[PDB]
């Protein structure tokens, strides 16, 4: 019909999820740390991008810091998620970049961009050594390397419990979104 004719001439990618995908995303949309398990890579990716956009939109509305890092475990996945997914979906609203490993610096992409696609190793190197976990409001972990990052998170949670006891400000920690297909 008339609606269908128009839709057939509407080329921009769309980020409307199926109801099942919405159901499994819901706790992440509410800001809860969670794992999402989906049956396809394309589905997992679309859900990740939707959650990232929702997250950053809410932070902007609330005048709170918003910055997403997406961690993968292969250099080729960095360029894929950057150029084929997050950039085409969100470039209208957010500064997206992929960094895998020559002039571009990881600490500087963290300062200047809103969605950073990188490897777990690069984050871990920047952390275990320029960058802090608190810099990010959301960390998306593909195929949920990660033991050290997770220990680091948990230790900051423990440290925050001490800071609270001491009537000192806590250090902000990101929401964690783990993905697995499937
Ligand atoms: Na799916």
From Swiss-Prot:
Q: Where are the transmembrane segments?
A: none
The listed locations are:
Cytoplasm; Nucleus; Mitochondrion
Q: What is the effect of changing residue 46 to G?
A: In AGS7; enhances the interferon signaling pathway activation; enhances the stability of filament formation; enhances dsRNA binding activity; no loss of ATP hydrolysis
Residue ranges annotated for the Helicase ATP-binding domain, each copy included: 25-182
Q: What is the effect of changing residue 44 to A?
A: Loss of dsRNA-induced ATPase activity. No effect on RNA binding. Changed MDA-5 signaling pathway
Q: Which residues carry this modification: Phosphoserine?
A: 10
Q: What induces it?
A: By interferon (IFN) and TNF.
**Tissues where this protein is expressed:** Widely expressed, at a low level. Expression is detected at slightly highest levels in placenta, pancreas and spleen and at barely levels in detectable brain, testis and lung.
Please report the PTM annotation for this entry: Sumoylated. Sumoylation positively regulates its role in type I interferon induction and is enhanced by PIAS2-beta. Ubiquitinated by RNF125, leading to its degradation by the proteasome. USP17/UPS17L2-dependent deubiquitination positively regulates the receptor. Ubiquitinated by TRIM25 via 'Lys-63'-linked ubiquitination, promoting activation of IFIH1/MDA5. Ubiquitinated by TRIM40 via 'Lys-48'-linked ubiquitination; leading to proteasomal degradation. Ubiquitinated by TRIM65 via 'Lys-63'-linked ubiquitination, promoting activation of IFIH1/MDA5.
Subunit notes for this chain?
Answer: Monomer in the absence of ligands and homodimerizes in the presence of dsRNA ligands. Can assemble into helical or linear polymeric filaments on long dsRNA. Interacts with MAVS/IPS1. Interacts (via the CARD domains) with TKFC, the interaction is inhibited by viral infection. Interacts with PCBP2. Interacts with NLRC5. Interacts with PIAS2-beta. Interacts with DDX60. Interacts with ANKRD17. Interacts with IKBKE. Interacts with ATG5 and ATG12, either as ATG5 and ATG12 monomers or as ATG12-ATG5 conjugates. Interacts with ZCCHC3; leading to activate IFIH1/MDA5. Interacts with RNF123. (Microbial infection) Interacts with V protein of paramyxoviruses; these interactions prevent IFN-beta induction, and subsequent establishment of an antiviral state.
Function according to Swiss-Prot or TrEMBL: Innate immune receptor which acts as a cytoplasmic sensor of viral nucleic acids and plays a major role in sensing viral infection and in the activation of a cascade of antiviral responses including the induction of type I interferons and pro-inflammatory cytokines. Its ligands include mRNA lacking 2'-O-methylation at their 5' cap and long-dsRNA (>1 kb in length).
Q: Family, per the entry?
A: Belongs to the helicase family. RLR subfamily.
Q: Which disease is it linked to?
A: Type 1 diabetes mellitus 19: A multifactorial disorder of glucose homeostasis that is characterized by susceptibility to ketoacidosis in the absence of insulin therapy. Clinical features are polydipsia, polyphagia and polyuria which result from hyperglycemia-induced osmotic diuresis and secondary thirst. These derangements result in long-term complications that affect the eyes, kidneys, nerves, and blood vessels. IFIH1 is the CADM-140 autoantigen, involved in clinically amyopathic dermatomyositis (CADM). This is a chronic inflammatory disorder that shows typical skin manifestations of dermatomyositis but has no or little evidence of clinical myositis. Anti-CADM-140 antibodies appear to be specific to dermatomyositis, especially CADM. Patients with anti-CADM-140 antibodies frequently develop life-threatening acute progressive interstitial lung disease (ILD).
What more does the entry say? Answer: In HIV-1 infected HeLa-CD4 cells, overexpression of IFIH1 results in a great increase in the level of secreted viral p24 protein.
Q: What is this protein called?
A: Interferon-induced helicase C domain-containing protein 1
Taxonomy, top ranks, is: Eukaryota, Metazoa, Chordata, Craniata, Vertebrata
Q: Which gene encodes it?
A: IFIH1
């Amino acid at each position: 019909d008339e609606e269908n004719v128009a839709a057939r001439a509407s080329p921009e990618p769309e980020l409307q999820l199926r109801p099942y995908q919405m159901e499994v995303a819901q706790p992440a949309l509410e800001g809860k740390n969670i794992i999402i398990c989906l049956p396809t890579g394309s589905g997992k990716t679309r859900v990740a991008v939707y959650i990232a956009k929702d997250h950053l939109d809410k932070k902007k509305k609330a005048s709170e810091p918003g910055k997403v890092i997406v961690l993968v475990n292969k250099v080729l996945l960095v360029e894929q998620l950057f150029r084929k997914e997050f950039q085409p979906f969100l470039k209208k609203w957010y500064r997206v970049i992929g960094l895998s490993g020559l002039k571009i610096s990881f600490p500087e992409v963290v300062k200047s961009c809103d969605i950073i696609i990188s490897t777990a190793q690069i984050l871990e190197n920047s952390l275990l050594n320029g960058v802090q976990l608190s810099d990010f409001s959301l960390i998306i972990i593909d195929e949920c390397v990660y033991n050290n990052i997770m220990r680091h998170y948990l230790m900051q949670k423990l440290k925050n419990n001490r800071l609270k006891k001491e009537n000192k400000p806590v250090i902000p920690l990101p929401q964690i979104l783990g993905l697995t297909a499937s």
